[PDB]
Amino acid sequence: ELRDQQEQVKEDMETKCFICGIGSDYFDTTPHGFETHTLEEHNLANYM
Amino acid sequence: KDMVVMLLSLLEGNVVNGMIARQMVDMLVESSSNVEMILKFFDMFLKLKDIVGSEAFQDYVTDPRGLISKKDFQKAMDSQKQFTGPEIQFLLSCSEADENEMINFEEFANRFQEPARDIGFNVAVLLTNLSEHVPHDPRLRNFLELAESILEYFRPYLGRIEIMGASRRIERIYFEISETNRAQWEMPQVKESKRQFIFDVVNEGGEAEKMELFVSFCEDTIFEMQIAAQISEPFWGELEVQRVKFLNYLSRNFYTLRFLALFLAFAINFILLFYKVSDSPPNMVYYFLEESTGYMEPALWCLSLLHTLVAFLCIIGYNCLKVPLVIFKREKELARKLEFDGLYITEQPGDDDVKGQWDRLVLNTPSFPSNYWDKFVKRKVLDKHGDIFGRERIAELLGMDLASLEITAHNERKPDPPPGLLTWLMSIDVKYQIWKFGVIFTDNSFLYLGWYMVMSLLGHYNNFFFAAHLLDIAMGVKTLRTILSSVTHNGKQLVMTVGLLAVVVYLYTVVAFNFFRKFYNKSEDEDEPDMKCDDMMTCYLFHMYVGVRAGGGIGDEIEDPAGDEYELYRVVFDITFFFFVIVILLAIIQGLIIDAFGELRDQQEQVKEDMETKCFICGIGSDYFDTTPHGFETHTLEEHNLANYMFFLMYLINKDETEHTGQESYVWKMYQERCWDFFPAGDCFRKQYEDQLS
Amino acid sequence: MVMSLLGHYNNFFFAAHLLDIAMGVKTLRTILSSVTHNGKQLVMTVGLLAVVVYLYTVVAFNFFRKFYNKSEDEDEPDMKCDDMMTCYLFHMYVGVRAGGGIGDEIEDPAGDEYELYRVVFDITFFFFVIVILLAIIQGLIIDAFG
Amino acid sequence: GQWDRLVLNTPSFPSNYWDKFVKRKVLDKHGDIFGRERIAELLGMDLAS
Numbered sequence A: 001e002l003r004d005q006q007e008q009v010k011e012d013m014e015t016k017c018f019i020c021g022i023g024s025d026y027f028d029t030t031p032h033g034f035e036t037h038t039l040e041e042h043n044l045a046n047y048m
Numbered sequence B: 001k002d003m004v005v006m007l008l009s010l011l012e013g014n015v016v017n018g019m020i021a022r023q024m025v026d027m028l029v030e031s032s033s034n035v036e037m038i039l040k041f042f043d044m045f046l047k048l049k050d051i052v053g054s055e056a057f058q059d060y061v062t063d064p065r066g067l068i069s070k071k072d073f074q075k076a077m078d079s080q081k082q083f084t085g086p087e088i089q090f091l092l093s094c095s096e097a098d099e100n101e102m103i104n105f106e107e108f109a110n111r112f113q114e115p116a117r118d119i120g121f122n123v124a125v126l127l128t129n130l131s132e133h134v135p136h137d138p139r140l141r142n143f144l145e146l147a148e149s150i151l152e153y154f155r156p157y158l159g160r161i162e163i164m165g166a167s168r169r170i171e172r173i174y175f176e177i178s179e180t181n182r183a184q185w186e187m188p189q190v191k192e193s194k195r196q197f198i199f200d201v202v203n204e205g206g207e208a209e210k211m212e213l214f215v216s217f218c219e220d221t222i223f224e225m226q227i228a229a230q231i232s233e234p235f236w237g238e239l240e241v242q243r244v245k246f247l248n249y250l251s252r253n254f255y256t257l258r259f260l261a262l263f264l265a266f267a268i269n270f271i272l273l274f275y276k277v278s279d280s281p282p283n284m285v286y287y288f289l290e291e292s293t294g295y296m297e298p299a300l301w302c303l304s305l306l307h308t309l310v311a312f313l314c315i316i317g318y319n320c321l322k323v324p325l326v327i328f329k330r331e332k333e334l335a336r337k338l339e340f341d342g343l344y345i346t347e348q349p350g351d352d353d354v355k356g357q358w359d360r361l362v363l364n365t366p367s368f369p370s371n372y373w374d375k376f377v378k379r380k381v382l383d384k385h386g387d388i389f390g391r392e393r394i395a396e397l398l399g400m401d402l403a404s405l406e407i408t409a410h411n412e413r414k415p416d417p418p419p420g421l422l423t424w425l426m427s428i429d430v431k432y433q434i435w436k437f438g439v440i441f442t443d444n445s446f447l448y449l450g451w452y453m454v455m456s457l458l459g460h461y462n463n464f465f466f467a468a469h470l471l472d473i474a475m476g477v478k479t480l481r482t483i484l485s486s487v488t489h490n491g492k493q494l495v496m497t498v499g500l501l502a503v504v505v506y507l508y509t510v511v512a513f514n515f516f517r518k519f520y521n522k523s524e525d526e527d528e529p530d531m532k533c534d535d536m537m538t539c540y541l542f543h544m545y546v547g548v549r550a551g552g553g554i555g556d557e558i559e560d561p562a563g564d565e566y567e568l569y570r571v572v573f574d575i576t577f578f579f580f581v582i583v584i585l586l587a588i589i590q591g592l593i594i595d596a597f598g599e600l601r602d603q604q605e606q607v608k609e610d611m612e613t614k615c616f617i618c619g620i621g622s623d624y625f626d627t628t629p630h631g632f633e634t635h636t637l638e639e640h641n642l643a644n645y646m647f648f649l650m651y652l653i654n655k656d657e658t659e660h661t662g663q664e665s666y667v668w669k670m671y672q673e674r675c676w677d678f679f680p681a682g683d684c685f686r687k688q689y690e691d692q693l694s
Numbered sequence C: 001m002v003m004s005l006l007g008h009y010n011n012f013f014f015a016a017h018l019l020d021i022a023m024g025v026k027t028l029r030t031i032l033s034s035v036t037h038n039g040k041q042l043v044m045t046v047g048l049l050a051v052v053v054y055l056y057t058v059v060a061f062n063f064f065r066k067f068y069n070k071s072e073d074e075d076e077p078d079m080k081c082d083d084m085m086t087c088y089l090f091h092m093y094v095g096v097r098a099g100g101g102i103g104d105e106i107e108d109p110a111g112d113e114y115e116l117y118r119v120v121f122d123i124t125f126f127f128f129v130i131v132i133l134l135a136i137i138q139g140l141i142i143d144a145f146g
Numbered sequence D: 001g002q003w004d005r006l007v008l009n010t011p012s013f014p015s016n017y018w019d020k021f022v023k024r025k026v027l028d029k030h031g032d033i034f035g036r037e038r039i040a041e042l043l044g045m046d047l048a049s
C-alpha cells in the first residue's frame, strides 16, 4: 500500500500538469510539449 | 540507376498527391510498354535464379559435367509453368549455348544478378515511393503487380524511416539495408543487448533523454558488431597470426569457457564430498579422500589444474571481448563532456567524482581516442574552447602540438615502421595503459573474474577453496539471478531492519540486566552457576544468539517466572519480545522479500505493456494506429521501426558524403551536431496526411 | 489404470488414486497452479539452498568438527562431521528442519576459542537459510496467487 | 514434425479433418516447383488414378 502511493504520486506528476490538470498526452502532440509546459507555461515555481 | 536517382530527387519533400509525383506517374503510364519490358527483364532472371536451384530442374540435368541441352532446358522451363512461349525462347537466346547446345545454367543464372541489383533496388524504391504518396491512382497498381517479385526480393533490404524534415513536415526516407548489417543485427548477442536496452529506458528512463540514449545504444551496437566481425573466423609473423587466432577463439567461446568453469567447479566439489578426516595417516589429524576406485585422487589434481587454466582463459577472453566496449563507452562520454560541456576546461569536477578525477590522465595521451571512432575530438575541442580559454593552454591540456597541425594538413609523411620488438617497447603509451588498467580494475565483471581466478589459485593451497566457485551459479543461471535480485532489491531495508533488531534486543538486555538477572542461570549444576546475564556484553550476546533463534522468544530459554514477585513483569517481557522480535520484525524481513517479487514482476509487465501500447519512436498510442486494421503492427515494423533507424545510421556512415541526398545530408548534419529533432515525436506520416490518405 | 491393476497386487496402491482430486476438483487445481506457476523458481531456490548448506558444511568440516558429537555416551562418540558426505547430510537433514538453524542441534559454543566464529556461523545460517531462503519459497507461492 | 512423416503417404491421412482433398491441393501448389511425381510419392498419390 505504501509503495503504490509513491508510484501513484510519481505517475500523476509525470502524466498531468499540477496547475491545469491537462494530461501529458495532449501536450505531447508538440515534441517535448509536456516538458516545456511544466517548465515554462504552468511551472508551479513561477506562481510562487 | 542514375536516371532513377534523378527521379527520386524530384520526389524529395513531396507531399501526398503532389503534382510532381502525379506527373511522374503520368510519365510512367505514357511509357508503360517500356516500363513493363524493364520490369519483365528483372523478374525473369530472378525467377530463373530460383528455378535452376529447384529440385524439379535438377531432375532434368543428366550431364555429369553440370550442363543442360537447349531441348532439355526447353522442357524444363515450361514444366515449371512460370514462363510463356516467347519468354523461354528469349532465355534460350540469352543462354550462351556452345556448338553442342549445352548450357551452363550455373553461370547463366548468376550472370545478371549482380549487374542488375543496383538498378532493380532503385526501381523498387521508386515504385514504393510513388505508391505511398499517390495511393489512389489505379494506373500505378498495375506496375506494382508486375513488380511483385522485385518488391518481394528487395523487401528485407528496403529500409524506410520517418523524420521531421527541415520543411517542418514528416518525411519518409527510403534507403538500402546491406545483407551484412541485417545479419549482424539478428545475432543473438545483439538481440539480447536490445532487450536489455529497451528494458532500461522504459523502466528507469525519461522522455527527454530517450532519443539520446537510443543513439548511444546505436553507437555501442555498431562498435560491438565490429568486434564480432574481427573475432569471427572464415617467426614473429608466425606467432602473431596464431596469437590473434588464439585470442579470437577465446573471445568467440567466452561463454562456453564460463560454463566449463562452472561445470568443473561442481566436479571438484563432488569429489570433495568424499573427504574424510582421521587421526591415523592415510596429535594432529589428516584430511584424505575415502574412495575405493583409486582414480578420484588423481582426478581431483587434474581437475584443479584444468579449472585454474579455464579461469585464466576467461580473463583473457573477457578483456578481448567485453573490455573494448567498456573503454569505448568511457572514451565516448569523456569526449562529449570535453566538447559539449568543457568538463576540464570550465567546471573542473570538485574532487568528489573519482571517475572524473581519474580521466585527467588520458587527456594529454597521444592515443586518447583509441576505441572511440572520433579521432579528431582534440581538434574539435581546440576550435570550440581555444578562443575563450587559450589555444596554447588547451593544447597543453590535451597534449597537442600546435606546430604539427599545419604540417599534417599540408602533406602526409610515410616513415619506416620497423617490425622489431625493441621498437615496440617505447611505442607503448604508458600513461594511457595506466589509465586503461584503472578502468578495467574498477569494472565489476572483471573484478568477479579476478576473484574467481584468485580463489582457483588458493584452491591449490587447500582444495576446499574450490567451494567458493559454486557461488557462480548466482550469475551462471539467470533464473537464480532473478531470484537473488528479489533479495538485493530491498537490501538496504534488510540491513536496516536487522540493525533495528539489534537495537530492540539491546533494550530487552538492559531491562534484563537491571531487573530479571536471576532467571538467566543456564547450568543444571547446583554449585557452579552459569549466569548468562551477569555482564551486559554476555547478556546481549545471549539474547541475540539464543533469544532471536528461539521459536517462542527469550522466554523459552530463561527459567520459568512462576511463583515469583516479578512474574507478571516477566510475562510482559516474554510476550512482547515474542511479538516485536519473533513475530513483527521477522515478518518485516519476509515482507520485504515478498514485496520485492511483486515490484520486480510489475516492472517486466510495465515494460511489456508500454512496448505493445505505444511506439518507441513517436510515442503515439496503439489506439490511434488501430483505426486501420493492423495499423500499430505495420507502424512498428515499417513506419517507425527502431531497427531501421539503427540501419540508417550505418547507411550514412558507409555512404560517401558527396553522394548523400538532401534528406540524408540533413540527418547526417544533425547527427554530428548531436541534435535529435529529426526523430518524429508525437507525429507521424499517417497523422500528417490523415485527410489525403483516408 | 496401471495403478488400479497394481492395487490388486497390494491394495495400498489404491492410495495413489486419491491424488486425482488435483484435477477432479477445479478449486484444488487452481490452488495447485499457484505452486506450479513458479515451479522452476522453486526448484532453483531449493538447489540454491543445497549449495549454501554445502558451503556451511565445508566451513564446519574444516574448523568446527568438535561440536558435532551427537552421542550422550562418553566412550563411543557419534561424530557427525568426520566425513564431508555425513556432515553435508547432517546439515541438510536436521539443520534445515531445525527452528533455530544448525545451532540448535550442535554443541554449545561457550567457553571456547572459536565461540565468536561459531555465533556468526549459527546466526548467519539462521538468517540466510531459515529466514531468507524459506521466505523466498513462501514468497514465490504468495506472488503466484497475485 | 518428425513423427508426422509417417502419415503423409497414408491413404487415410485426413480421417478426422474435413478437407479430404488436401493432397490434391498440395500437388497443384507445389507440383510445378518440386516435381509432380515426387510430390505424389511423398503424399502416396496415384497420378494415374
Ligand SMILES: CCCCCCCC/C=C/CCCCCCCC(=O)O[C@@H](COC(=O)CCCCCCCCCCCCCCCCC)COP(=O)([O-])OCC[N+](C)(C)C
Binding pocket: B451, B454, B455, B458, B461, B462, B464, B465, B467, B468, C055, C058, C059, C062
Ligand atoms: C575466505 C573465502 C573468500 C570468499 C568467501 C565466499 C565463499 C563462502 C565459503 C567458502 C568456503 C571457503 C573454504 C574454507 C576452507 C579453507 C580451509 C583452509 O584452507 O585454511 C587455510 C588458511 O590459509 C589461508 O587462509 C590462505 C588464504 C589467504 C587468505 C584467505 C582469504 C581469501 C582472500 C579472498 C580474495 C578476494 C576476496 C575479496 C572478495 C570478497 C568475497 C567475494 C589453511 O590451510 P592448510 O595450511 O592447513 O593447508 C595447506 C596445505 N599445506 C600447508 C601443507 C600446503
Ligand SMILES: CCCCCCCC/C=C/CCCCCCCC(=O)O[C@@H](COC(=O)CCCCCCCCCCCCCCCCC)COP(=O)([O-])OCC[N+](C)(C)C
Binding pocket: B504, B507, B508, B511, B513, B514, B515, B566, B569, B570, B572, B573, B576, B580
Ligand atoms: C514499575 C512498572 C514500570 C514498567 C512499565 C513498562 C513500560 C515500558 C518500560 C520499559 C523499561 C522499564 C523500566 C522501568 C523504570 C524503572 C521501574 C522501577 O521503578 O523499578 C522498580 C522495579 O519494577 C520492575 O521490576 C519493572 C520491570 C520492568 C519490566 C517491563 C517489561 C517490558 C519490557 C519492554 C522492553 C523494552 C523494549 C521495547 C522495544 C520497542 C520495540 C517496538 C523498582 O526498582 P528497584 O528499587 O528494584 O531498583 C532498580 C534496579 N536496579 C538496582 C538495577 C536499578
Ligand SMILES: CCCCCCCC/C=C/CCCCCCCC(=O)O[C@@H](COC(=O)CCCCCCCCCCCCCCCCC)COP(=O)([O-])OCC[N+](C)(C)C
Binding pocket: C002, C006, C009, C010, C012, C013, C015, C016
Ligand atoms: C510407486 C507409486 C507410483 C506413483 C507415486 C504417487 C503416489 C504417492 C504414494 C502412493 C502410495 C503408494 C503405496 C505404497 C505401498 C505399496 C507397498 C507394496 O505393495 O510393495 C510391493 C512392492 O512391489 C512392487 O513394487 C510392484 C510395483 C511395480 C513397480 C512399482 C512402481 C509403480 C510404477 C508406476 C507406473 C507409472 C508411474 C509413472 C508416473 C510417475 C508418477 C505419476 C510389495 O508388496 P507385497 O509383495 O508384499 O504384496 C503382494 C502380495 N503377494 C505378493 C502375496 C501377492
Ligand SMILES: CCCCCCCC/C=C/CCCCCCCC(=O)O[C@@H](COC(=O)CCCCCCCCCCCCCCCCC)COP(=O)([O-])OCC[N+](C)(C)C
Binding pocket: B462, C052, C055, C056, C059, C061, C062, C063, C114, C117, C118, C120, C121, C124, C128
Ligand atoms: C580468520 C577470520 C576469517 C573469517 C571471515 C568470514 C567471512 C566469510 C568466510 C567464509 C569462509 C571462512 C574461511 C576463512 C579462510 C581461512 C581462515 C583462517 O585463516 O583459518 C584460521 C582459523 O580461523 C577460523 O576459525 C575461521 C572460522 C570461519 C568461521 C566464519 C563463520 C562464517 C560462516 C559463513 C559460511 C559461508 C556460507 C555463505 C553463504 C552465502 C549465502 C548468502 C586458522 O587456520 P588453521 O591454522 O587452523 O588451519 C585451517 C584448518 N584446516 C587444517 C582444516 C585447514
Ligand SMILES: Nc1ncnc2c1ncn2[C@@H]1O[C@H](COP(=O)(O)OP(=O)(O)OP(=O)(O)O)[C@@H](O)[C@H]1O
Binding pocket: A013, A014, A016, A017, A018, A019, A038, A039, A042, A043, A044, A045
Ligand atoms: N505545473 C508543474 N510545475 C512543475 N512540475 C510539474 C508541473 N506539472 C507536472 N510537473 C512534473 O513535476 C515533476 C517534478 O519536477 P522536477 O523533478 O523537474 O523538479 P526539480 O525542482 O528539478 O526537483 P526534484 O527532482 O526534487 O522534484 C516534473 O518532472 C514535471 O514533469
Ligand SMILES: Nc1ncnc2c1ncn2[C@@H]1O[C@H](COP(=O)(O)OP(=O)(O)OP(=O)(O)O)[C@@H](O)[C@H]1O
Binding pocket: B191, B195, B611, B612, B614, B615, B616, B617, B636, B637, B640, B641, B642, B643
Ligand atoms: N518503434 C518500434 N520499433 C519496434 N518495435 C516497436 C516499436 N514501438 C513498439 N514496438 C513493439 O516492440 C515489440 C518488440 O518487438 P518484437 O518482439 O517484434 O522484436 P523481434 O526482433 O521480433 O524480437 P523479440 O521478441 O526478441 O523482441 C513489438 O511487438 C512492437 O509492438
Ligand SMILES: Cn1c(=O)c2c(ncn2C)n(C)c1=O
Binding pocket: B219, B222, B223, B373, B653, B671, B672
Ligand atoms: C564514423 N562514425 C561516425 O561518424 C559516427 C558513428 N556514430 C555516429 N557517427 C556520427 N560511428 C559509429 C562512426 O563510426
Ligand SMILES: [Ca+2]
Binding pocket: B658, B659, B660
Ligand atoms: Ca552530390
Ligand SMILES: [Zn+2]
Binding pocket: A017, A018, A019, A020, A021, A022, A037, A042
Ligand atoms: Zn498546466
Ligand SMILES: [Zn+2]
Binding pocket: B615, B616, B617, B618, B619, B620, B635, B640, B684
Ligand atoms: Zn511511431
